[model samples]
Structures are given as C-alpha cells and as structure tokens.
Target: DDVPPRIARAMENEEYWDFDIFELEAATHNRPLIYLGLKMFARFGICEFLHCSESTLRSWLQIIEANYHSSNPYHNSTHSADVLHATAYFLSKERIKETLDPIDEVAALIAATIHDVDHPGRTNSFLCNAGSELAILYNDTAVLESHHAALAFQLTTGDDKCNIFKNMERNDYRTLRQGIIDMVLATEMTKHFEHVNKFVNSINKPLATLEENGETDKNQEVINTMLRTPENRTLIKRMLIKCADVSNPCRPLQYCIEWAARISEEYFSQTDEEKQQGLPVVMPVFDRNTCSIPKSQISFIDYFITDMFDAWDAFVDLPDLMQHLDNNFKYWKGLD
Candidate 1:
C-alpha cells in the first residue's frame, strides 16, 4: 500500500520512458527488475502466451535478480531494470512495433532483463587482460556477454519452478533462446561500430527511402520485407538492445548525471583494483584521483554516443532523446 502512486502511473502511461528507477527500486524493496519484468510480461500478455504461471514467473525473476551483484555501483540489477524500461518503452513506439512479432517482443524484454546478469562491475577487457576464467572460457570473444547468456539459461533450467521457457514448444523455444543469445551478445562494446553501421545501412536507409517517397503501403511492404528474414530481424534487435543498454546519456540531466557518476565510480574501482594487482590499467584516464569526469564524459559523447544515437534517431525519430543528448553533451562541455 505504501508504494508510490507515481510508479503505477508511470507504468500505465504507454509513452513514459524516463520514470525514475531509483524510486521504483525503493518502492519494490530493491526488486526493481522483478517488479518491472512482471509488469512488462503482463502488459505484453507474454505470460498468457507462454503459459507461464505466476509462481514460475516470480521465481524466475527472483533468481535473475539474485544473480546480479548488489555491491557494484553500476552494472547491477538496477541497470537491468533501467534497460528493461527502455526496451519496453521502445516496444511501445509505433515504428518499432511495426517490425516485431509478439514473440519477438517477449524475447526483447527477457533479453533486456537478463543481459547483464551476474556482471562483476568490471569490463570484458579487464577479464581478458587478467586472464580470468570467463575470458578463457569464452576465448576472449564477448566474454561477459557469453557468460550472461549461458548462465541465464542455466539458472532458468536449474529449477522447474523458474523455467519460464520450459512450456514452450521445442521449435518456439529454440527461436526464443536464439533471440536472447543474439541480443545479449550484441551488447558487447567490441562490436558496437559493426552493429551501428549495419543498422544504418539495413534499417535506417530503407526507412529514409520510405519517408521520402511518402508511400505508406509500398513503404511498409519494403520495410516489412527487410524485416522478414531472421538475419535482418536479428540485426534490428541487436541495434535496439544496444541503444537501450547505453541510453543513459540520452536521458534527462538528473538521470544522466547519476548514471555517469555510477559508471565512473565503477571504472575508478577497476583502476584501483588493477593498481593493487600490478596489472595494466585498461583505461588509465579513469584513475579516480586524476580523472576529470566532465572531460571524460565530453570525449565519450563525441567519440561514441553521438553517431550511434544519430543513426538510431534517424530510424526511430526520437527528437526528445536527441534533444536530451544535445543538452547532456552541452552540459558536460560547459563543465569541461
């Protein structure tokens, strides 16, 4: 009864994308992912279609949340919740919905919820450079993402009560599993440029043609044809999750500032650990004592955030997000 009415109100608004996750986390007793996941599954009718019982869904969410490291300043379940929120909001967009099937929607939400499960607050580069077990296990190819995907399935199958995919038909289950794996792997920063380029060429280019021609039926047919194949669909889903994963910079100032600090702290902690272990600092600028957050953020926006979001905004037409990106960049630049 004490949960904020704003949480419920935000969930009810189909267009709401920037709802405060900290508030949701507090209201749900630190179970933001579980609460948001359940809400999304129910909202999307995924539970009904997948035959997922309430108890099973709850158990699965709890297990997923339990795997995340609460001690990490970022890359925790709250980040997952924030990504899930972004994924859900994107799904609600008319343009995004045009290309996705109902099952695709389910896969997107699940992938967002579990993408960073069990993250250690350190980067894949750290793991590979340190010769950590996970890096060896994944052969240094998207090490953390590989683990998150594999471990998510293991956690689900470990118990029947939380095996949300158990009731699906074998073929359907395979498709969903493949979708989840592809989406999670796409979150790896190593392939960010590849994904963004593919998205621009495959999705954005066609959409631009359609917009220019002003032909609704013919345009939709072309767009639908592009999304018909599994390859094209996977590319789009990859882009979607990638955008949602790093969307903090495009959020409002307060949210953007908080996320920036959390990620900076995580980086600082990694630098400190490297110092203690006599290992090379992967990002030397992240040294807590010497790093300039504003300068780093400004460089980050110029190098990574702007072009990717430009391509995405071209396809999705998110003027609000683009404006926020501009505002945040200016804010950092002003400080620098």
Candidate 2:
C-alpha cells in the first residue's frame, strides 16, 4: 500500500514537525551538526560537477579530505553520500513499504551513509592478486566490504559521530548493526543476485498473503523472520546500491555527461598509475576515446530497471519512473 502522502511528506521533511522537535533533542547532543556536515558535503559535490566552480569545488574537496582522507579511491565520501541519498529516496517512495521495515530503513540509511567509510578503491581481485593489506586482513573473502563496514561502525562509535544514537538501548544498536551488515554484504556484486533473489521471494510472498487479507502491519515478527536469513535480503539491497552507485546514468543528460567525464578522469589516472608501476593493463580499465555513458545507460535501463520495476509493478505506482526510463533511452539514442 502506498504510504499516505501526508506521512511520507512528514517523514522526509521532519524539520517542520515542530520547533521543539528540531530544537536539539535532549539538549545534550547536536544531531543536526552531523546533518549539516553531510548536507554541505553533498551540496559541494553537486555544485562542483554541475556548475563548474573551481573555488567551491576545492573547498568541498578539502572538507571531504579532512573528514574522509582515509577512504580508498572507490569508496570515497562522494560514494557514501551518494548511496545514502539514494537509499533515502528509495525508502521514501510510497510503495516501498512491503519490502522495507522502519527499523530496517533507518539502519539501511545509516549503513549506506558509512558503508564505504574508508575504502581502498581496489577491487577484491586486485587485492588478492597483489596480496595487499586488505587481502591479508580479510583473508581475501570480500575484504574491502568487510573493512568498509568495520570502519563505519568504528566511526559511529566515536564521541562525535556515535552520540547521534548514544542514548538508544543496546538491542536497537544490535538491530542497527545487523542492518548495516546485511547492506554492506549486499554491496559485493559477486554475491548480490543470489541473496537479493531470495529476499525478494520471501517478502514478496508475504506481501501477497497480506494483500489477500486486505490488511498489513509492520510486524516485527515478520521482519525477524526475513532477517533470519540475511542473505535473503541481499539481492534487492545489492541491486539498489548498485543502482545508486551508478545513478549518474539516470540523471539529467548534462549532469550525466559531467559525471561520465569525472569517472573517465578517475579511471584513466588509475590505469596510467598501474602502467607506470609496470603492471599489466587491468581488464577494461579506461575507455578514453569511447562515449560509453550514453550506451551504457541505455543498456542498464533496458536490462535492470525495466526488469526490476516489472517485478515490483504489482505493488507500486511506478508510471513516472517507467516514463523516465523510456525518455532516458530515447535521449541516449539521440546522443548516439
């Protein structure tokens, strides 16, 4: 069932709930400060690429480096923020309730915010081949994913970051940790499809049962049943994160083009560095001459978005998204 528009609006824009609600919960900690920091960083990123302002871009870069300099090339602050925004939007969608729990949503949002807290950018294969520290630390089983989740938890435990939920009880924290683990695990694409398929089947069936009854409840029991097999929820979250990770493809054409340029720069720099180190070329590292974005987006929308939405169409109103997908495909074709 669609979340009532009023409730959805309130949840997404909670600042208007009440002056007191926004007036420093408990008057002891500053929750808004973290939000402010995240906002500034997100805005800086959006403006830097979309508007082409060097001074603004440099300032945001400095802020990001100061806060997240330890992240690897792949799991930088930009990636974390991007994932969080995408998760929020997904959860905020009115028809998303059947697949998401409130606690799960909160946990997923937090996890997305910090999933790549300190990434080392290299793929798992790269680390295993090179015997990097990540491989040694994790024994080569999706080590980067493990490290990123650990760092997110570690950072949140700090005095500044942890206090956001410090007063919460232990059980809540455990639930949050579980949610984070499930989400982080889903990010490893090698494991995504299997896990997500199980998850979709599980909740989707339960949703069918509820629809038959003409009633639904956010039952903790149902949620725990699903959580019992964390791997079950794996695929949807994995696909969601993947979509979020490459969201530039679905963005406005001009903005999408700019992201493609930035991505090209990042990829070329890595490929050049690898060659300088006398390493064999990485498989398909950089497409310097090809305009792959237009084609890639079209292919992705056709393969993933169309199919995924079709699976969920029975439960949701995605006409707008469906139209957007068609429009994007046409736009990409025009570019070609």
Candidate 3:
C-alpha cells in the first residue's frame, strides 16, 4: 500500500541491458525480488506453463524473497533479482529462442529467481571448515549451492499458497525439478572452469567445425548439430545460469563497480571471521586493509570473466555485453 508511482517508470526500463536494480530496490522498500520476480515470471509465461494461479506465484516469490538473508552485503534477494533480469535478457536473445523450449525457459527463470535463497553471507569453504550442519548434510561438496537448490524446492512444496508445481503431473514435475536443480547447482564455483570448458568444446567447437561443412540451408542443421544431444542441452542450461550468477563484471561500468565493492566487502568480512577462528585457508586472504578493490576486480575479469564470457558471446552474439565487459575491464585497469 505504500509504493510510489515511480515503480511504473522502473518497470518500463526493467528489460533493458542497463536496468538499475539498486534503484528499484530502494524504490520497492527493500523487496525488489518480489516485484521483479512477479513481473519476470508472469512475463515468461511461467504461470500458464505450470497451470498455477498468479496469487500462488506471488506467494512463492514473496516466500523466496523473504529467505534471501537481507543482512548480507551481496548474496541477497537483490542479487537474485539482478540475475533474473540477466536471465530474462539472455532468454530474449534470438539464438536462445532457437536453443531452448518453453519448458526450459520456464525452468530457467524459476531457477534464477531462487538460485541464492538463504545464502548465509559465507563461502561454502567456511561452512565446511566450520563443520556446520548444512556442510555435513551435503558432505562438504558444494555445500551452499546444494542447500540453496534443495531448500528452494522444500520451501515451495512445503506450503500450499506457494506450491506452483503442485498441479503438475508426476513425470512433468520431475523434469522441471531436475531442470531447476541442475541450473542452481551449476552456479557452484568448484566446477566453474569445467562448465565453461565443456560449453566451448560441446557447443562452440561444434559451431566452428560444422558451419561451413554442414548441409545446405545450414541454419537448422547447425542448431541441431550444436544442441542435438541431451547432454548438449544440459550444458546450455548450466552455462546460462552460471553466466548469470556472477554476471556483475559483464554489466554496465557503474554496476560492475558497485558489485565488486559488495562482493569484496563480503569476502573481507569472511576473511576477518576466519582469522579470528584461526581457520587456515591457503589461498586469497582478502584482508580489508591491503586488498586492492581495483586489482581484485581486474584479476576477477582476467581469470574468470574473460573466457566464460568469450564462450557465451560466441554462442549468443552479446555485443553490448561484450562491450560493457571490455569497458569495465579497462576501467578497473585504469583505476589500478
């Protein structure tokens, strides 16, 4: 009952590449996830696909948004909202339409919306080191990501108001559940390089090898050759969400800067806690005193962001994003 008329203006710009989620969060009373999720979910036809009522989806979005640990600097519902925006933006690209079916589209949006639900502002290694209950439950492998995916499902099915999948058939529901879980788990950093390398080999390499060599009227033939197998489709879904999860460096320069600060602070806080606990992590101790935010952002783009976005832009022709990425990388280098 307290929303201003400016939300209408923000919604109009929500689909663009430079959509400012930070401003929307400020406008929406710190619950941008609920508003943005509802818009994207309905816009993606998820309700029609699942045969669920709008109110049910609303309830699900509210519940999911509530669980995102708002006290955290970064891994909160705003991150999820930004990821959702990126996912929808990517989904709207022409190449993706040929690449994914409606069900896959539906599943991708849901997966993005709830990918980081209830993140504890700590890394998975922290949980494993601390021997937290969730770490033991998931056996220390992808502890946080596993919990995120699993908890999203549990919460959805646990309540009647938000149970969008309750109306789905047995087998159909199983397929969508697996789709969401796979995408959620794909956000795990443990297999980051493997996911990117696999996509290049499985998707990009085939495109390079087949385009000139495949049959005449080569468009459909090229697509079939690329996304032909079940495993190929799996990689695409995995690749899409993985890219969306840490897509900060790929956004506009301002966004890239803000996200770098947020994640760096989160990492700094974790490092301080680990220090007090005497947890001896061998790599990348982000002491807030000497940690160069510009250097950190630059290294992140150099090591992780470059090849992954290279593989993605090659697959989908994201010229604007590639340009933003290039600009942001240079900005960090200049700042350093």
Candidate 4:
C-alpha cells in the first residue's frame, strides 16, 4: 500500500501528548516504527549531532522494527513506536530540553524504540515458571528487559549499514551505550516503585524545596547545580522512559480504551498459554473468559499509573494528561 496523504499530516505531531499512534500504524501499513523513527530522529536532529548518516539510521530503524513481534498485540512495534513518541514528546518539553544534553536526548530516543524489542508476549514470571530458556539465561530476573537491551546492541552493531553508533568515539559510545541500557532496564517492573520514588526524591523534591524556600541567590545556585548533577539528570531520563512505557491512561479516553483492549488481549493470551503449559498463571484475573476490562483499567490506573503520573505532572505541568487521567478513571468506573 502506498503511503496516504493523511499520514503526512500526522507525521510530526509528536509535540502533542495525545498523538494518535494507532492511526499512524494503519496509515503507514504497519511500519509505524521505522517511519516514526525516521521522522522523530530527524526532527530531533540526532543524525546531525552524532554524525550518523540518514541512510544508516534508516537501516537501523528497519532492523529494529523487524525485531518487534507483530503477533503480540501489545508488546509489538506499535507499542514501541508509541513509547518512542512519548519519549520524544517528554524530551521536547521545555525544562527537559534544558536538562538533557544532546547525547542524553539521542540515547533516550534509541532506548524507547528498542525497549521491548523481540518480546515473546509473556511476563518474566511466566518465563521463570515455565522454565523458559530466557528466564534460565537471565536467572529469572528482568529476563525480557535484559534480552531486549542486549539484542538491541547486538543487532545494531552486526551490520555496518545500520550501526548508528559506528562512528562514535570509543568512550562516548560506551557512555551512550550505558545510558541506553540503563533506561531500557529501568522499564523492568520489578523495581517500579523504587525507580518512581527515587525520581521524586532525587529530581522533584529538591525543586519543591527550592520553591518553598523562595528562590534566593544560594537557592538559585542549588536549583542550577542540583538539576545539572549527572545523577539527577539520569534520574530524569529514567523517569521519562518509564512514564512513556506505561502512559496509556494519560492519553485520551478513546486511546486509553484501545490500549486497554490490546494490553488485556496480551495478558489474556499469557494466561491461556499458562493453562496449556500447566504453569501457574501470573494473573488469573486477566483470564479472558472471566474478566472485566473496565475493572482492569481502573485497577491498572490506580496501582501502576496514578502516583507516578501525579509526580510526573507535578514536575512537567502536564495539565492535559492529568485531566485525561481523571476522566479516564471515571470513564472506566462508569463502564465497570
């Protein structure tokens, strides 16, 4: 299918928080990851900054998108593209642009698209209980995320045509590689609360403290120095990718519902596969035959999304997403 006129119109709206990712999926005939990747990377000027050729970046995008399993409903290229968009959107915000250097921005965009590459559509717990090879390889700890990061680098470097980092200085490449790996690993759910709270303490609380103390000269110095601290900037990047990874509820109601259905389908598939394998179900409540999608959305928002979003909006001042979260919560509750 030829690319449509409508697709061109939506191409660069990564600026919008509620960008319709699904539309672009169909618009580009299921290659949303690469098209969006090219569009966003160019928009961010990553190629120019890194001295990477456009063709190499495009080749790299093709390889990365090829690795995503479209058979899986949620953890596919579309989800990756969505996260990539969200990652870029957050990076485009004013304060973030000020906080992140060019390298950080480039690392983030790379991390987002490859975070869930080659996912097998099952949770780590299922992989562990089923004695799956990946779980064994990773010792049942962040198995999927571990594979995604390693495979990302492996696939990228294997082909000179697509090695975007091939021209990077050795130590610079190491630093960029470390940031990408760390951001990808942070998406692992095992320490979700730990990462979020640390972001709040390390990045948010200091600003809050400065505000309360009335921005005096020394207080201004504290503000300038603390945010520039490498540790805190990394925390900011971590939080950006983490939020982007699970930001469905922060989208519009229609988008939230569609994402809800897709992820529920993925979970239901996991549960059914568990039953067939005689493995303990990781989430029995997600069984398709006896599940309530609305309730699932409500609980998901309450547990996984709510407070991190609260902390996020506090720092970023995303009134639109907060409004959407509230409306989406009520929307699901009413449906339930």
Candidate 5:
C-alpha cells in the first residue's frame, strides 16, 4: 500500500520521521506490539533509562491506556515515542560523532522515551498543590521529573527486567545508571540553561586544547574514570538531549504547530484541578483561547535558540549542521 497522503506531505516538508504511517499509528495507539517492542528495547540494553521487563512495561502501558482519551491527550505514549525518536536522531548527527558514543546514544534514547512515561497529565505544580504521591516522594522539587526517573529505575530493578543487564558488570551498571540520570534530569527546562552553560564550557575548552595539542589531557581523567564527571562525552550527550528537549520551536511551522497543540491540550486539561486546588498555571500552554503559541514560540526562538546556537557555534565546527539550524529557525520565523 502507498503511504497516506497526509503522512507523505509531512515527509515532503521534512517535518516528520520517515516511518511507515501504519506502524506509527499502531504504536501511537499503544498496542501490545509497541509494549513488546519497548520491552525488547529494555532487554537489549537499547536504553538503560527504561529497562522495563515485558510485564512491567505492559503494566505501565495499561495505566496510561486507561487514561488515554482524557483531556490530556497530548502527553500519551505518542509524545514519548516522538521525543525518543528525535533524541536518537539528534544524537546520531555526525557533527557530534567524535564526542558521542553508541552507549550515550542508547542512554539518550531511553531517557527521552520514558521521560514522560506514566505521566499523570498534571503539571509539576498541580501535583504539588494536590499533594499527589509524586510530589510527596520528590519533596516538591521537579516533581514530575523525579517520578519519571524513579519509574525508569523501578523497571530496571524488577526481577523480570534485571536479567537485561546480566552481561553488564556491577561497575558498568553503575555507570549506566549515572548516565541515564544525567540525561533525564536535563529535561527539566527549569534547569536547561544552567546545565547548558556547563556543557558549553566543557566542550569549548577541550576543543581549543585539542586543536593546539592534537589531543588534550582534560578528557584523559574522565575516560580513565569509567566516563565519570560530565566530561567530553557526557557534556555532548547532555547538550544534544537538552537541544532535542526544547527543539519543537526550531521545527518547521506545521510540525511546530502540531507540537503547540499537543502541549496546550496537555496543559489546559489540568486547569480545573489547578483552580480547584489553588495552584498557579505553570507554563504558557495552560491557558486556552490564547494566541500565545506563536508568540511564545517566537520568544523561545529569540532567546533560547538564538543564544544556544551562538554558544554552540563557538564550539562545533560543522558547517552543514550549523546551516541546518539556521534553516530551521528561518522556517519558523517565516511562518505566519
């Protein structure tokens, strides 16, 4: 069968991943096959952040499925997969190939996929206001982020999923856990810029030394210490994931429009509870009937993306990659 016209249009515009439409629809609907695939992803060590066994993945999927058609239609399994796919693609870009490793790619993929898994469709503030279990567990600090990371760990530690890391030594397992933590924690936009500053510093300094000495001893201590301490590899991984995390505004107009829809739907769905519990709305997406999407996206581009690209340009020498970023921003700017 031919690709659906709508999906074809998406590809033509370079606004979507070139996946088969039927497969994407099926996975987005949270069918058993998707659950099985997620289990396999965990089993094969594809993403240490979400090493859920077949049963654990299935259980979590069921919880989410029960709430699928609720007002918060935006934060379902589809968003999880979309972010995960984008993270994998962004990390695989050749510009960062010298710094990123296969393991880091796997970790990034996992972090993105499960980053929003088991979402309660409530904002971090909502959870805190309602005294939700997650808020209590996390002590009100990046509540949703903490829940997501904890769920990922629960999956990996379960007996059914524990075997997935059988080939990994105890030390290797520790390193994998730390790497996943760093990636997942970076998704908290409240901390995005602060973390990126450190990443930019790590890269530019080492890159400068490399050009002068042909190699640098700065990363030597990190590599020798089992990839410890957010050095070259970790910094690049963090930056790429952080970039993907906030990359929607950098996408083409129509795709960015779709993302804005999803985010708004998710946020508006929680407003009643927020009002009932007297919690302030957390982000721009929470308000309905507002033309803030385009405006906020414009602001996002003017501030975050522009500043990020400037800092990134100083460190990355990839002309083509820089051009792509420029083209993406231009596309958004040209949108009505």
Candidate 6:
C-alpha cells in the first residue's frame, strides 16, 4: 500500500497530463489500473453521485483489472491505465468540461479503462484472416471493441460485489451504460476518420461561425446549442476517447518514444506469429528483421495522428499537446 512519491505527485497534479505508468505499476504492486480508476472516481466524486459503496467500487476495479490480458506488450492493462490517464487529462480541459455533463465524464473514464480489455495482441485483420470465432461473431467490424464492451458488462454483472452500477436509478443506469458502450466502440480504428469528420463538421464548423461573426467571446450559447443535441454529444465523446486512445504521439518526447517502441514491438510480435502460423502478414513492414521503428512511427504520425489531433486541438486548444506532436514527429523524422 506504499505509494511512490512520484505516482502520488502525478495523481495530485491534475494540470499535468503525463503520469509515469512504470512508477505507478510498481507503486501499486501491479494494480495501476485499479489505482487509477479509484483515484479518478474519487477525484470526480463518481461514487458519491451514484451512491455506490466503497467495497462495491473496489470490487469493480479489481474485476475490471483482472479482465485485461497482461501478456500483450502494448494492449495490456498498463496501456489501459495510460489511456485512462489521458481521458482524465482531457476531461479536465476547459472545452471538454464545458460540453460534457458529470455523467458523461464518468462514462468516458470507465470506457477508457476497459477499452482494450482482453486484447489478444493481434489486429482485426489478423482475426479475420485466421477465421477466428470472434471475427465470425462480430462480422469482422470492431470485433475486439465489441468483445471488450460485452465482456466488461458481463464481468460487472456476475458478481454482486463488482456491480458498481447496481445502486443507480434505472434510467440513469441505462444512460450511463449506453454512453460507456458507445465510447468503447468509438475506439475502433476502422471508424476513426468517420468520427473525426463528424466532429469537425458538427462541432468545429459552428464554432468557427461564431468567430467570424465577432461573437466568439460571447458565444457560449451558440456553442452549447451546437453540442447539446444527442448526436453532437455522442460525436464529442467519440472524439474525446479517440484522441485519448492515440494521444501517445502527442506525449512528451521520452514517453512518446517509449510508446512508439512498445506499439512497434506489439506489431512485430504479431508479424512473427503470422509467419510461424503461415498466415498472410497483415503488415509486412512490421517484419522484425526489416522494419525501422523510426520510419514506421513517422508514417503513422503523418497518415493517422496529425489530422485527428489537429481537429481535436482546434476544438480543445491544447497548445502543449500540439507542440509535443511537432517535436516528436521531428525526432522520428530525424531518425528516418
């Protein structure tokens, strides 16, 4: 139960986006996810609002942490903890706080914590190619995400101790449950561009109109009107979790490099497995012997990372994150 000073400091410093996941893992005795979940719930007063008991919340966190597959290099519980940290960080942003209700905030945190639970260290393409049962079951579209959402709910339901949602009013519980499921499904990469486009069109475009009309400083009403609809609210939540899920490239240089290496290692392992099993390599560039991590990361930043974060920054005004992204991209470019 001895918390490392650095980890405790990180939890207390809400303004800081980076939490030292390695230190947190060691400090919590490999319970980083649970520790983080508890901290966020307490920080946001989610338990008190939902009338959830401390024991029930603790059991819920334990069950959620236990469900994550720890064997994967990048998609393990540590990755979930990192994403949760990012989600909490985003929830603190002025733009997000203005748009999301307390229930939305709670849903986003829980969704991020369980987003990649039980990931098999393989891509959806790999699953489809191998004709895995999950692929068949979900028709190869966001298969892992669907499984994660379903399994998380299943784990919560089987044990009364872990049923944190048990104390909620039926209507509120339904809304929270739906919000969590929607946010989890939005983490699927296949739908990334679709969600980004929706965010840009629905949220950013109207805000721009206010700026042009010289009402930007006095347009809280306009902005809220645009975002208050169920559709726009859902889009905002989708963009929020999507940014958090892939915000690794926007982290400080050393942390960014570490994440790049971890994700590259995961891809390399997948390619190695495919070769051993004689399946088509989903991404041949990830072949361990021939791949350049720097080049791969650079390509990733260019193709996927930049535009999405650009849109998010326009909406959220994360100057620090934008700067980090530029610096990290340059570092990878220099290596390439």
Residue by residue across 110-203, what tens digits does model 3's lDDT show?
Answer: 9999889989998898898888999999999999889998899899999999899999888989988898989998999889999999999989
What do the candidate models score in CA lDDT, each in turn?
0.86, 0.53, 0.87, 0.89, 0.59, 0.86
Give the clash count for model 6. Answer: 0
**Backbone collision count in every prediction?**
0, 5, 0, 0, 0, 0
Task: Give per-model TM-scores.
Answer: 0.94, 0.65, 0.96, 0.96, 0.71, 0.95
Q: Give the per-residue lDDT digits (tens) of candidate 2, residues 167-188.
A: 4567876776776687776677
Q: Give the TM-score of candidate 1.
A: 0.94
Error of 5 at 205 (Å): 5.5
Candidate 4 ranges with C-alpha deviation above 4 Å: 1-4
Name every residue pair that clashes in candidate 4: none
The reply for model 5, stretches above 4 Å from the true place, is 1-23, 26-71, 161-163, 205-230, 281-286, 309-336
Model 3 scores worst on lDDT over the 10 consecutive residues at: 1-10
Local accuracy of candidate 5 as per-residue lDDT tens digits, 1-336: 254455334334222333332245453444422443353355445534434345555554454344333335566665665565556556545555545665676677667766776677777777776788888989999888777777766765555433355455677677777887888887776786787787666666655555565345865554334333346677777776776666655544455567766776666667755666567665635466664655565666777776675666565533443555566566656766
User: What C-alpha lDDT, on a 0 to 100 scale, does residue 306 get in candidate 1?
Assistant: 89
Cα RMSD for predicted model 2: 10.9
Candidate 6 off by > 4 Å: 1-14, 216-218
lDDT, candidate 4, 156-195, per-residue tens = 9988998998888898899999999999999999879999
Q: Order of candidates by lDDT, top first?
A: 4, 3, 1, 6, 5, 2
Q: Report per-prediction Cα RMSD to one decimal.
A: 2.0, 10.9, 1.7, 1.7, 5.9, 1.8
In angstroms, the error of model 6 at 170 is 0.7
Per-residue lDDT of 133-154 in model 6, one digit per residue for the tens?
9999999888999999999999
Which candidate do you rate higher for TM-score, 4 or 6? 4
lDDT of 1 by residue, 1-336 (tens): 234676665455434765778777676666788777877888899888788897899899999999999888888888998999889888888778887888789999999999999999999989989999999999988899999999999999988999998888889998899899999999988898999889888877776776687767878687678766778778778888998999998998999999999999999999999999999889888999999998888888887788998887876678888889889989988883
Best by lDDT: 4
Question: Model 2, stretches more than 4 Å misplaced?
Answer: 1-75, 158-163, 203-242, 280-282, 289-291, 298-306, 309-316
What lDDT, from 0 to 1, does candidate 5 have?
0.59
